Design a protein around this ligand. Structure first.
Ligand code: HEM
Ligand code: HEM
Lengths: 370, 370
């Protein structure tokens, strides 16, 4: 039996080959933040900031108070699966005399025809992902990281999200999103032969060894439109059942794990999984092997004057190279996906997330020490 | 040993003498929403709305889907302690020909000198409180309630909140707030002799029988100033220790439940619990018996362009009469409370929350039938 107390007592590793928050299980609470370096902050100031942040992250992920006078907001709680993950934006390198170390992988994402990006709420020099299963643990961490930045960097944008909690279901199962879909069934996962090739920069720029590239997209769901559709219409947009996430090509004994049949046709000769269904056209085998790990949070930030919900998905994906992951898939989806009609990409960021800190190190040390 | 599945499996009762969400334990996720009646919505349209809303609440609190057009967002989750609670504002009665039934208890709150209220995110004809320990369960309920409003009402304002998750601590403990304080120790509970008298209208206008009056305050915490204080300074603002919630008058053996000594002085003759300490001056015995149940959520909605967090407490208190609860205590706190310097009241609502629905009834039926 899994005890209730495991929610708090579960602890993620800070030190490791890879940073936490990539293969870590889904967390109930998320805070994404971007910071811009202050005028006059260069390499040396940036290195000091990453040391402060890494010292803080190490402490908080072990359920210990912050290095400087802790607020007590997380006191009483266990680590609650807190993770803190750090990335660097294209713009960071030009602020710190590190242009020669800027990866080609940080070249700007395309201007997709369906983009509706608030550029002020996009991009940024530095990115931090905080997640935990307790909201006080998570907020405490956000606040400590943000306070560590002080005058050295300002908050450029900051978004809040959530997911299903541990124990909400009778047994662990794939999460849902605010469209009601089963979301998370098909991802690359650790132990697959090609997982590292797909997701992480290998050990043989050198500072990104064992790192990954994240693309963040704030995707509003057009729930007012979506929720007027029939079930058949909604399932045809994805190619999978809302009940259990099974492919539409499955019968009654099909489950979430049943393999999709992309050739199956009904009695009229029409494909059972539609030609433009999201879960057809996003597959690696439909994109020359293009692949990513998806690890999102859902969001809801209110209603506008007409009752339209500011709700959707904080889409967060991980890949060794955006040109073999997010970019080619999104080029296809832009106009090609049945889902595009029902969503709006409203903010974006692409960040280089290095390998995990070893004992005594700070995240990004190889970059900033050189 | 309490299993993790209890987070999802626990179920609150909808039907009863009192509405749920008053004495119910704290929940990890909250949504507060106010609605204004649309043009063309009078008594009969409001009665139909409360019928819809009550049926939605009944189903969803039992872990069932909505009666029709369910979105599947909560599917597979247990009830996760979902509660839905309904109230009526002062403005409701003049929109529905029900002025004769408007309780005196809904008379407008004082304009306190410390108020900085957003009129547009304050008050409203109707209020709904949604809470649960799973965020998908909670969102699904918010969306269902909001979609039941249809042509009858528009969202006036809506706020998100959070608290500690079940299982975050190694055993059940009093909550904390974003100032890092123990918060909730001296909350009145069923089983204390004056509880029913303090909190519920007795078996006012008859339609309010077994109801309670809620005052909602969106109180921003001035965390930038608060977190520059010493521990000693912070503990003097409240009169209780941050570590364990004990009164400052207590010894090293004292805990949160240790009775406060209001006369105790130090070696220089100065009061150990300061004269203007929040946890001194808010006591019923310092306010001629004025008392309330407090059952809040914390909030954080991001950062403004200047780096200031929009974070604080959704203060939600319950009393049989605001003039014997919130009102006289807040008159005293307004300028008198050491805490006032570090908080800002930025929205407010006062709602009449009637008794619970009996089997075969809807909430507010004694008011609205006709
Ligand atoms: C709000 C926006 C989106 C929604 C609601 C959504 C929903 C889903 C759903 C329901 C599935 C099927 C279950 C699963 O395997 O996870 C799925 C699969 C997937 N989606 Fe999305 N998706 C969104 C955006 C994106 C974007 C922007 C990309 C990439 C550019 C993407 C890439 C994928 C991939 C790669 C799969 C797995 C395909 C496979 O190998 O089976 N999705 N999505
Ligand atoms: C963000 C704003 C506020 C914060 C941070 C705060 C914090 C606290 C803390 C830490 C305690 C002591 C522990 C406890 O017994 O719960 C407490 C007690 C209390 N507060 Fe507040 N408070 C706030 C606003 C208010 C307001 C607006 C009122 C009423 C108008 C209020 C009424 C009370 C009462 C009645 C008690 C219990 C006193 C007793 O009988 O021991 N508080 N508050």
């Amino acid at each position: 039996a899994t005890p209730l107390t495991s929610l708090g007592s579960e602890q993620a590793m800070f030190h490791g080959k890879h940073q936490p928050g990539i293969t870590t299980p889904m967390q109930a609470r998320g805070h994404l933040v971007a910071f811009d370096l202050a005028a006059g902050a260069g390499r040396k100031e940036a290195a000091a900031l990453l040391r402060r942040w890494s010292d803080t992250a190490r402490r908080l992920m072990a359920g210990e108070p912050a290095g400087s006078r802790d607020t007590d907001v997380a006191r009483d709680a266990g680590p609650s699966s807190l993770t803190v993950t750090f990335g660097f934006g294209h713009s960071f390198f030009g602020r710190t005399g590190l242009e020669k170390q800027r990866p080609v992988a940080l070249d700007p994402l395309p201007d997709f025809s369906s983009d509706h990006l608030d550029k002020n709420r996009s991009n940024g020099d530095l990115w931090v992902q905080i997640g935990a299963d307790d909201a006080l643990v998570a907020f405490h961490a956000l606040r400590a990281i943000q306070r560590d930045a002080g005058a050295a960097a300002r908050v450029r944008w900051q978004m809040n999200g959530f997911n299903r909690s541990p124990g909400a279901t009778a047994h662990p199962m794939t999460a849902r999103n605010l469209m009601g879909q089963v979301d998370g069934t098909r991802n690359p996962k650790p132990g697959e032969a090609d997982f590292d090739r797909r997701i992480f920069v290998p050990e043989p720029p050198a500072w990104m060894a064992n790192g990954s590239y994240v693309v963040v997209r704030r995707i509003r769901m057009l729930l007012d439109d979506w929720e007027e559709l029939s079930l058949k219409a909604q399932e045809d947009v994805i190619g999978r059942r809302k009940s259990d996430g099974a492919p539409l090509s499955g019968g009654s004994g099909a489950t979430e794990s049943t393999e999709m049949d992309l050739e199956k046709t009904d009695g009229s000769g029409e494909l059972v999984v539609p030609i433009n269904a999201h879960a057809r056209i996003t597959r690696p085998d439909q994109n020359g092997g293009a692949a990513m790990v998806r690890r999102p949070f859902s969001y809801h930030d209110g209603f506008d004057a007409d009752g339209v919900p500011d709700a959707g998905l904080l889409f967060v994906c991980w890949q060794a190279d955006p040109l073999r992951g997010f970019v080619p898939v999104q080029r296809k989806l832009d106009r090609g996906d049945a889902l595009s009609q029902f969503i709006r990409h409203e903010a974006s960021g692409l960040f280089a997330v290095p390998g995990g800190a070893a004992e005594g190190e700070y995240v990004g040390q190889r970059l900033l020490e050189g």
